[PDB]
Design a binder for these strands. Sequence first.
DNA 1: AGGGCCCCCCC
DNA 2: GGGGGAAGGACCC
Length: 388
Amino acid sequence: SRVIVHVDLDCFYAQVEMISNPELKDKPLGVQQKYLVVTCNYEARKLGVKKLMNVRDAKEKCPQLVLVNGEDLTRYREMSYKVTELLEEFSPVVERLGFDENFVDLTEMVEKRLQQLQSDELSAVTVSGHVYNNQSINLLDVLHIRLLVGSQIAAEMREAMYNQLGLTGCAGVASNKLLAKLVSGVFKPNQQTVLLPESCQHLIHSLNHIKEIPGIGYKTAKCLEALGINSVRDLQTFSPKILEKELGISVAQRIQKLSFGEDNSPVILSGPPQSFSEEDSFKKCSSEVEAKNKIEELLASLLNRVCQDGRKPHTVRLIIRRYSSEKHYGRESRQCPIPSHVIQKLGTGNYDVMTPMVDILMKLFRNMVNVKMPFHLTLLSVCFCNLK
DNA sequence: AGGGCCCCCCC
DNA sequence: GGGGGAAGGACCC
Ligand SMILES: Cc1cn([C@H]2C[C@H](O)[C@@H](COP(=O)(O)OP(=O)(O)OP(=O)(O)O)O2)c(=O)[nH]c1=O
Ligand SMILES: [Mg+2]
Protein backbone atom coordinates (compact mmCIF):
# COMPACT_ATOMS: atom_id res chain seq x y z
CA SER A 1 0.00 0.00 0.00
CA ARG A 2 1.32 3.40 -1.04
CA VAL A 3 0.69 6.89 0.34
CA ILE A 4 0.90 9.38 -2.51
CA VAL A 5 0.39 13.14 -2.35
CA HIS A 6 -0.58 15.37 -5.26
CA VAL A 7 0.29 19.05 -4.90
CA ASP A 8 -1.60 21.44 -7.16
CA LEU A 9 -1.06 25.18 -6.85
CA ASP A 10 -3.81 27.78 -7.08
CA CYS A 11 -4.00 29.64 -10.43
CA PHE A 12 -0.22 29.43 -10.70
CA TYR A 13 0.59 32.19 -13.22
CA ALA A 14 -1.79 34.63 -11.56
CA GLN A 15 -0.09 33.83 -8.24
CA VAL A 16 3.35 34.50 -9.63
CA GLU A 17 2.09 37.77 -11.13
CA MET A 18 0.31 38.84 -7.93
CA ILE A 19 3.45 38.23 -5.89
CA SER A 20 5.29 40.50 -8.32
CA ASN A 21 2.76 43.34 -8.25
CA PRO A 22 0.87 43.37 -4.89
CA GLU A 23 -1.63 45.91 -6.21
CA LEU A 24 -3.16 42.98 -8.09
CA LYS A 25 -4.06 40.66 -5.21
CA ASP A 26 -7.36 42.46 -4.68
CA LYS A 27 -8.84 42.79 -8.16
CA PRO A 28 -9.89 40.26 -10.84
CA LEU A 29 -6.66 39.25 -12.57
CA GLY A 30 -6.10 37.26 -15.71
CA VAL A 31 -2.86 36.29 -17.38
CA GLN A 32 -2.98 36.79 -21.14
CA GLN A 33 -1.14 34.84 -23.82
CA LYS A 34 -1.90 36.06 -27.35
CA TYR A 35 -5.62 36.80 -26.93
CA LEU A 36 -6.05 33.82 -24.61
CA VAL A 37 -6.48 34.21 -20.85
CA VAL A 38 -4.73 31.00 -19.80
CA THR A 39 -5.62 31.65 -16.18
CA CYS A 40 -6.92 34.16 -13.65
CA ASN A 41 -7.00 34.53 -9.86
CA TYR A 42 -10.01 33.25 -7.89
CA GLU A 43 -10.96 36.87 -7.26
CA ALA A 44 -12.23 36.71 -10.85
CA ARG A 45 -12.95 33.02 -11.31
CA LYS A 46 -16.20 33.87 -9.53
CA LEU A 47 -17.03 36.38 -12.27
CA GLY A 48 -17.65 33.64 -14.82
CA VAL A 49 -14.09 33.80 -16.15
CA LYS A 50 -13.08 30.16 -16.65
CA LYS A 51 -9.68 30.38 -18.33
CA LEU A 52 -11.64 31.31 -21.46
CA MET A 53 -10.24 33.08 -24.52
CA ASN A 54 -11.39 36.44 -25.89
CA VAL A 55 -9.63 39.12 -23.86
CA ARG A 56 -12.71 41.34 -24.23
CA ASP A 57 -15.02 38.90 -22.42
CA ALA A 58 -13.93 39.42 -18.82
CA LYS A 59 -12.78 42.94 -19.71
CA GLU A 60 -16.33 44.27 -20.00
CA LYS A 61 -17.64 42.41 -16.96
CA CYS A 62 -14.56 43.80 -15.21
CA PRO A 63 -13.12 47.17 -16.31
CA GLN A 64 -10.25 46.88 -13.83
CA LEU A 65 -9.44 43.34 -14.94
CA VAL A 66 -5.86 44.55 -15.26
CA LEU A 67 -4.68 41.74 -17.54
CA VAL A 68 -0.98 40.87 -17.63
CA ASN A 69 0.98 39.24 -20.45
CA GLY A 70 2.28 35.79 -19.59
CA GLU A 71 4.03 34.84 -22.84
CA ASP A 72 7.53 34.85 -21.33
CA LEU A 73 7.55 31.77 -19.06
CA THR A 74 10.90 32.37 -17.35
CA ARG A 75 9.52 33.56 -13.98
CA TYR A 76 6.92 30.77 -13.84
CA ARG A 77 9.46 28.07 -14.65
CA GLU A 78 11.80 29.36 -11.94
CA MET A 79 9.11 29.33 -9.27
CA SER A 80 7.96 25.94 -10.56
CA TYR A 81 11.37 24.43 -9.89
CA LYS A 82 11.63 26.10 -6.50
CA VAL A 83 8.40 24.30 -5.56
CA THR A 84 9.68 20.93 -6.80
CA GLU A 85 13.00 21.36 -4.97
CA LEU A 86 11.26 22.33 -1.73
CA LEU A 87 9.14 19.21 -2.13
CA GLU A 88 12.21 17.09 -2.95
CA GLU A 89 13.60 18.14 0.44
CA PHE A 90 10.68 16.41 2.18
CA SER A 91 11.17 13.30 0.05
CA PRO A 92 13.38 12.61 -3.04
CA VAL A 93 10.87 10.84 -5.29
CA VAL A 94 8.99 13.75 -6.84
CA GLU A 95 7.26 13.88 -10.22
CA ARG A 96 6.40 17.08 -12.07
CA LEU A 97 3.36 17.42 -14.32
CA GLY A 98 3.27 20.79 -16.02
CA PHE A 99 4.59 23.81 -14.12
CA ASP A 100 2.45 23.59 -10.98
CA GLU A 101 1.65 19.96 -10.22
CA ASN A 102 3.87 17.58 -8.28
CA PHE A 103 3.34 14.00 -7.15
CA VAL A 104 5.29 12.82 -4.16
CA ASP A 105 5.63 9.23 -2.97
CA LEU A 106 5.42 9.47 0.83
CA THR A 107 5.29 5.74 1.60
CA GLU A 108 8.73 5.37 3.21
CA MET A 109 8.49 8.72 4.98
CA VAL A 110 5.11 7.85 6.49
CA GLU A 111 6.45 4.54 7.83
CA LYS A 112 9.57 6.12 9.32
CA ARG A 113 7.25 8.43 11.23
CA LEU A 114 4.92 5.66 12.41
CA GLN A 115 7.80 3.53 13.72
CA GLN A 116 9.20 6.59 15.50
CA LEU A 117 5.83 7.08 17.21
CA GLN A 118 4.94 5.48 20.56
CA SER A 119 2.50 2.60 21.03
CA ASP A 120 0.18 4.99 22.86
CA GLU A 121 0.24 8.27 20.95
CA LEU A 122 -0.71 6.21 17.90
CA SER A 123 -4.34 6.58 18.95
CA ALA A 124 -3.81 10.33 19.10
CA VAL A 125 -3.00 10.59 15.39
CA THR A 126 -5.33 13.09 13.73
CA VAL A 127 -6.05 14.35 10.26
CA SER A 128 -4.95 17.65 8.78
CA GLY A 129 -7.53 19.17 6.46
CA HIS A 130 -10.58 17.52 4.86
CA VAL A 131 -11.51 13.84 4.92
CA TYR A 132 -13.17 13.08 1.59
CA ASN A 133 -16.92 12.35 1.72
CA ASN A 134 -16.73 13.22 5.40
CA GLN A 135 -15.83 9.57 5.96
CA SER A 136 -15.37 8.34 9.53
CA ILE A 137 -11.83 7.56 10.62
CA ASN A 138 -10.89 4.25 12.25
CA LEU A 139 -7.72 4.66 14.28
CA LEU A 140 -7.24 0.88 14.36
CA ASP A 141 -7.17 0.71 10.57
CA VAL A 142 -3.47 0.73 9.62
CA LEU A 143 -4.25 2.18 6.20
CA HIS A 144 -6.33 4.97 7.80
CA ILE A 145 -3.45 5.82 10.15
CA ARG A 146 -0.87 5.89 7.36
CA LEU A 147 -3.08 8.09 5.18
CA LEU A 148 -3.69 10.47 8.08
CA VAL A 149 0.05 10.73 8.63
CA GLY A 150 0.23 11.44 4.92
CA SER A 151 -2.20 14.32 5.43
CA GLN A 152 0.16 15.71 8.10
CA ILE A 153 3.13 15.72 5.73
CA ALA A 154 0.95 17.38 3.09
CA ALA A 155 0.00 20.18 5.50
CA GLU A 156 3.69 20.67 6.32
CA MET A 157 4.57 20.95 2.61
CA ARG A 158 1.83 23.50 1.96
CA GLU A 159 2.84 25.50 5.04
CA ALA A 160 6.51 25.47 3.99
CA MET A 161 5.56 26.39 0.41
CA TYR A 162 3.75 29.43 1.78
CA ASN A 163 6.27 30.50 4.44
CA GLN A 164 9.32 29.97 2.21
CA LEU A 165 7.96 30.84 -1.26
CA GLY A 166 4.74 32.77 -0.67
CA LEU A 167 2.62 30.34 -2.72
CA THR A 168 -0.69 28.67 -1.84
CA GLY A 169 -2.12 25.48 -3.29
CA CYS A 170 -4.11 22.33 -2.71
CA ALA A 171 -2.95 18.85 -1.84
CA GLY A 172 -4.53 15.44 -2.18
CA VAL A 173 -3.50 12.37 -0.22
CA ALA A 174 -4.45 8.90 -1.48
CA SER A 175 -3.11 5.38 -2.18
CA ASN A 176 -2.16 6.03 -5.82
CA LYS A 177 -1.58 8.91 -8.29
CA LEU A 178 -4.99 8.77 -9.97
CA LEU A 179 -6.92 9.05 -6.69
CA ALA A 180 -4.48 11.63 -5.20
CA LYS A 181 -4.86 13.81 -8.28
CA LEU A 182 -8.68 13.44 -8.27
CA VAL A 183 -9.10 14.13 -4.57
CA SER A 184 -6.75 17.14 -4.46
CA GLY A 185 -9.40 19.02 -6.42
CA VAL A 186 -12.39 18.38 -4.09
CA PHE A 187 -11.86 21.58 -2.03
CA LYS A 188 -9.96 23.81 -4.47
CA PRO A 189 -9.27 27.09 -2.90
CA ASN A 190 -5.99 26.49 -1.01
CA GLN A 191 -7.05 23.40 0.96
CA GLN A 192 -6.23 19.69 1.16
CA THR A 193 -8.19 16.42 1.20
CA VAL A 194 -7.28 12.85 2.11
CA LEU A 195 -9.07 9.81 0.62
CA LEU A 196 -9.71 6.80 2.85
CA PRO A 197 -10.15 3.46 0.94
CA GLU A 198 -13.87 2.95 1.63
CA SER A 199 -14.64 6.14 -0.35
CA CYS A 200 -12.77 5.28 -3.53
CA GLN A 201 -15.91 4.28 -5.44
CA HIS A 202 -17.77 7.37 -4.30
CA LEU A 203 -14.89 9.50 -5.63
CA ILE A 204 -14.73 7.69 -8.96
CA HIS A 205 -18.49 7.77 -9.54
CA SER A 206 -18.59 11.48 -8.67
CA LEU A 207 -17.06 12.08 -12.09
CA ASN A 208 -19.54 12.85 -14.85
CA HIS A 209 -17.63 11.49 -17.84
CA ILE A 210 -14.86 8.94 -18.38
CA LYS A 211 -12.88 11.79 -19.95
CA GLU A 212 -12.57 13.39 -16.52
CA ILE A 213 -10.45 10.41 -15.49
CA PRO A 214 -6.68 11.14 -15.44
CA GLY A 215 -5.15 9.01 -18.18
CA ILE A 216 -8.06 9.30 -20.62
CA GLY A 217 -7.81 12.32 -22.90
CA TYR A 218 -9.66 13.65 -25.94
CA LYS A 219 -8.70 10.63 -28.05
CA THR A 220 -9.73 7.63 -25.93
CA ALA A 221 -12.78 9.58 -24.78
CA LYS A 222 -14.07 9.65 -28.38
CA CYS A 223 -13.20 5.98 -29.00
CA LEU A 224 -15.06 4.87 -25.87
CA GLU A 225 -18.10 6.99 -26.74
CA ALA A 226 -18.51 5.51 -30.22
CA LEU A 227 -18.47 2.20 -28.34
CA GLY A 228 -21.41 3.14 -26.13
CA ILE A 229 -19.38 4.30 -23.13
CA ASN A 230 -20.03 7.64 -21.44
CA SER A 231 -20.16 7.10 -17.68
CA VAL A 232 -17.53 5.65 -15.36
CA ARG A 233 -19.82 2.73 -14.45
CA ASP A 234 -20.22 2.07 -18.19
CA LEU A 235 -16.47 1.38 -18.38
CA GLN A 236 -16.35 -0.62 -15.16
CA THR A 237 -19.03 -2.96 -16.49
CA PHE A 238 -18.11 -3.05 -20.19
CA SER A 239 -16.97 -6.44 -21.50
CA PRO A 240 -13.17 -6.56 -21.09
CA LYS A 241 -12.75 -8.75 -24.16
CA ILE A 242 -14.40 -6.30 -26.53
CA LEU A 243 -12.46 -3.41 -25.01
CA GLU A 244 -9.25 -5.41 -25.40
CA LYS A 245 -10.12 -6.07 -29.04
CA GLU A 246 -10.49 -2.33 -29.63
CA LEU A 247 -7.63 -0.55 -27.88
CA GLY A 248 -5.34 -3.52 -27.35
CA ILE A 249 -4.61 -5.65 -24.30
CA SER A 250 -2.30 -2.92 -23.02
CA VAL A 251 -4.55 0.13 -23.10
CA ALA A 252 -7.73 -1.84 -22.41
CA GLN A 253 -6.56 -3.35 -19.14
CA ARG A 254 -5.06 -0.05 -17.96
CA ILE A 255 -7.92 2.19 -19.00
CA GLN A 256 -10.40 -0.16 -17.35
CA LYS A 257 -8.50 -0.47 -14.08
CA LEU A 258 -8.61 3.32 -13.83
CA SER A 259 -12.42 3.19 -13.94
CA PHE A 260 -12.24 1.31 -10.64
CA GLY A 261 -9.79 3.77 -9.12
CA GLU A 262 -6.93 1.29 -9.60
CA ASP A 263 -3.59 2.68 -10.77
CA ASN A 264 -0.22 1.05 -10.07
CA SER A 265 1.97 3.51 -11.99
CA PRO A 266 5.01 4.57 -9.94
CA VAL A 267 5.74 8.19 -9.01
CA ILE A 268 8.66 9.01 -11.35
CA LEU A 269 11.61 11.10 -10.16
CA SER A 270 11.57 13.92 -12.72
CA GLY A 271 14.97 15.27 -11.81
CA PRO A 272 16.44 17.89 -14.15
CA PRO A 273 14.61 18.77 -17.43
CA GLN A 274 15.30 16.50 -20.39
CA SER A 275 14.67 19.30 -22.92
CA PHE A 276 14.39 23.08 -23.39
CA SER A 277 11.63 23.86 -25.90
CA GLU A 278 10.34 27.38 -26.60
CA GLU A 279 7.52 27.97 -29.08
CA ASP A 280 6.42 31.32 -30.54
CA SER A 281 3.38 33.10 -31.98
CA PHE A 282 3.28 34.96 -35.32
CA LYS A 283 2.48 31.69 -37.07
CA LYS A 284 -0.75 30.71 -35.32
CA CYS A 285 -2.59 34.00 -35.87
CA SER A 286 -0.60 35.67 -38.66
CA SER A 287 2.90 35.28 -40.11
CA GLU A 288 5.02 36.47 -43.04
CA VAL A 289 6.87 33.23 -43.83
CA GLU A 290 9.55 34.45 -41.42
CA ALA A 291 12.76 32.47 -40.98
CA LYS A 292 15.89 34.32 -39.87
CA ASN A 293 13.61 35.32 -36.99
CA LYS A 294 11.86 31.98 -36.40
CA ILE A 295 15.36 30.86 -35.38
CA GLU A 296 16.80 33.88 -33.59
CA GLU A 297 13.60 34.44 -31.63
CA LEU A 298 12.56 30.88 -30.85
CA LEU A 299 16.21 30.21 -30.04
CA ALA A 300 16.78 33.59 -28.39
CA SER A 301 17.47 33.34 -24.65
CA LEU A 302 17.03 29.63 -25.32
CA LEU A 303 20.79 29.86 -25.82
CA ASN A 304 22.32 32.44 -23.48
CA ARG A 305 20.19 30.82 -20.79
CA VAL A 306 21.10 27.14 -21.15
CA CYS A 307 24.60 27.45 -19.70
CA GLN A 308 23.15 28.31 -16.30
CA ASP A 309 22.29 24.70 -15.48
CA GLY A 310 25.57 23.89 -17.20
CA ARG A 311 24.38 21.16 -19.55
CA LYS A 312 24.88 20.53 -23.27
CA PRO A 313 22.09 19.58 -25.74
CA HIS A 314 22.64 17.26 -28.72
CA THR A 315 19.45 17.49 -30.78
CA VAL A 316 17.08 20.06 -32.31
CA ARG A 317 13.44 19.43 -33.25
CA LEU A 318 10.75 21.53 -34.95
CA ILE A 319 7.11 20.62 -34.25
CA ILE A 320 4.35 21.75 -36.62
CA ARG A 321 0.56 21.42 -36.77
CA ARG A 322 -2.19 22.56 -39.14
CA TYR A 323 -5.75 23.84 -39.48
CA SER A 324 -7.71 20.69 -38.66
CA SER A 325 -10.92 19.61 -36.92
CA GLU A 326 -12.09 17.62 -33.89
CA LYS A 327 -9.70 19.33 -31.47
CA HIS A 328 -5.99 20.09 -31.82
CA TYR A 329 -5.18 17.53 -34.52
CA GLY A 330 -1.66 18.59 -35.44
CA ARG A 331 1.57 16.75 -34.70
CA GLU A 332 4.46 17.00 -37.18
CA SER A 333 7.99 17.55 -35.84
CA ARG A 334 11.55 17.30 -37.24
CA GLN A 335 14.70 16.50 -35.23
CA CYS A 336 18.45 16.56 -36.01
CA PRO A 337 21.97 16.42 -34.46
CA ILE A 338 24.00 19.31 -33.08
CA PRO A 339 27.75 19.18 -33.89
CA SER A 340 30.10 19.51 -30.92
CA HIS A 341 33.51 21.21 -30.89
CA VAL A 342 33.11 24.76 -32.21
CA ILE A 343 29.31 24.35 -32.26
CA GLN A 344 29.18 23.25 -28.62
CA LYS A 345 31.90 25.69 -27.59
CA LEU A 346 32.42 27.10 -24.10
CA GLY A 347 33.73 30.58 -24.84
CA THR A 348 32.67 33.75 -26.65
CA GLY A 349 32.02 32.45 -30.16
CA ASN A 350 28.50 31.14 -29.58
CA TYR A 351 26.86 33.12 -32.40
CA ASP A 352 28.34 30.62 -34.87
CA VAL A 353 25.54 28.17 -33.99
CA MET A 354 22.98 30.72 -35.16
CA THR A 355 23.50 29.99 -38.87
CA PRO A 356 23.67 26.16 -38.59
CA MET A 357 20.33 26.05 -36.78
CA VAL A 358 18.93 28.09 -39.65
CA ASP A 359 19.63 25.70 -42.53
CA ILE A 360 18.40 22.62 -40.62
CA LEU A 361 15.12 24.16 -39.47
CA MET A 362 14.92 25.72 -42.93
CA LYS A 363 15.10 22.29 -44.56
CA LEU A 364 13.11 20.14 -42.14
CA PHE A 365 10.37 22.70 -42.73
CA ARG A 366 10.41 22.72 -46.53
CA ASN A 367 10.05 18.94 -46.19
CA MET A 368 6.94 19.31 -44.02
CA VAL A 369 4.24 18.07 -46.42
CA ASN A 370 4.78 21.13 -48.62
CA VAL A 371 1.82 20.40 -50.91
CA LYS A 372 -1.47 20.41 -48.98
CA MET A 373 -2.13 22.96 -46.23
CA PRO A 374 1.42 22.89 -44.79
CA PHE A 375 1.77 26.68 -44.74
CA HIS A 376 0.09 29.32 -42.55
CA LEU A 377 -2.15 27.16 -40.35
CA THR A 378 -0.99 27.50 -36.73
CA LEU A 379 2.40 25.97 -35.91
CA LEU A 380 5.94 26.92 -34.85
CA SER A 381 7.72 24.98 -32.09
CA VAL A 382 11.41 24.21 -31.56
CA CYS A 383 13.06 21.84 -29.06
CA PHE A 384 16.42 21.06 -27.45
CA CYS A 385 16.23 17.42 -26.32
CA ASN A 386 19.04 14.99 -25.48
CA LEU A 387 21.30 16.47 -22.82
CA LYS A 388 24.14 14.99 -20.78
C1' DA B 1 -1.01 29.71 -26.67
C1' DG B 2 4.11 27.98 -24.34
C1' DG B 3 6.43 23.86 -22.18
C1' DG B 4 7.67 18.73 -21.40
C1' DC B 5 7.70 9.21 -23.19
C1' DC B 6 6.22 6.17 -27.24
C1' DC B 7 10.45 4.56 -40.69
C1' DC B 8 15.11 4.37 -41.95
C1' DC B 9 19.56 3.00 -42.03
C1' DC B 10 23.66 0.10 -41.82
C1' DC B 11 25.53 -3.63 -39.11
C1' DG C 1 19.46 -11.19 -34.39
C1' DG C 2 20.78 -5.89 -32.79
C1' DG C 3 21.63 -1.35 -32.19
C1' DG C 4 21.15 4.45 -32.89
C1' DG C 5 18.59 8.60 -35.28
C1' DA C 6 15.28 10.85 -37.11
C1' DA C 7 9.99 12.73 -37.64
C1' DG C 8 6.16 12.58 -35.72
C1' DG C 9 2.37 11.18 -32.45
C1' DA C 10 -0.20 11.30 -27.82
C1' DC C 11 -1.13 13.04 -23.55
C1' DC C 12 -0.95 16.85 -19.81
C1' DC C 13 -0.15 21.33 -17.32
C1 LIG D 1 -3.52 23.52 -18.84
C2 LIG D 1 -2.92 24.27 -19.07
C3 LIG D 1 -2.20 24.99 -18.06
N1 LIG D 1 -1.33 26.07 -18.32
C4 LIG D 1 -0.48 26.94 -17.27
C5 LIG D 1 -1.48 27.91 -16.65
C6 LIG D 1 -1.40 27.63 -15.16
O1 LIG D 1 -0.91 28.71 -14.39
C7 LIG D 1 -0.38 26.53 -14.98
C8 LIG D 1 -0.99 25.40 -14.14
O2 LIG D 1 -2.16 24.48 -14.79
P1 LIG D 1 -3.41 24.32 -14.17
O3 LIG D 1 -3.28 23.77 -12.96
O4 LIG D 1 -4.53 23.44 -14.78
O5 LIG D 1 -3.91 25.94 -14.14
P2 LIG D 1 -4.23 26.78 -12.73
O6 LIG D 1 -3.15 26.55 -11.62
O7 LIG D 1 -4.13 28.27 -13.17
O8 LIG D 1 -5.78 26.46 -12.16
P3 LIG D 1 -6.23 25.95 -10.63
O9 LIG D 1 -5.96 27.03 -9.56
O10 LIG D 1 -7.76 25.67 -10.70
O11 LIG D 1 -5.47 24.64 -10.23
O12 LIG D 1 0.13 26.14 -16.26
C9 LIG D 1 -1.18 26.44 -19.71
O13 LIG D 1 -0.45 27.36 -20.09
N2 LIG D 1 -1.83 25.79 -20.72
C10 LIG D 1 -2.68 24.73 -20.46
O14 LIG D 1 -3.25 24.20 -21.55
MG1 LIG E 1 -3.00 24.33 -10.46
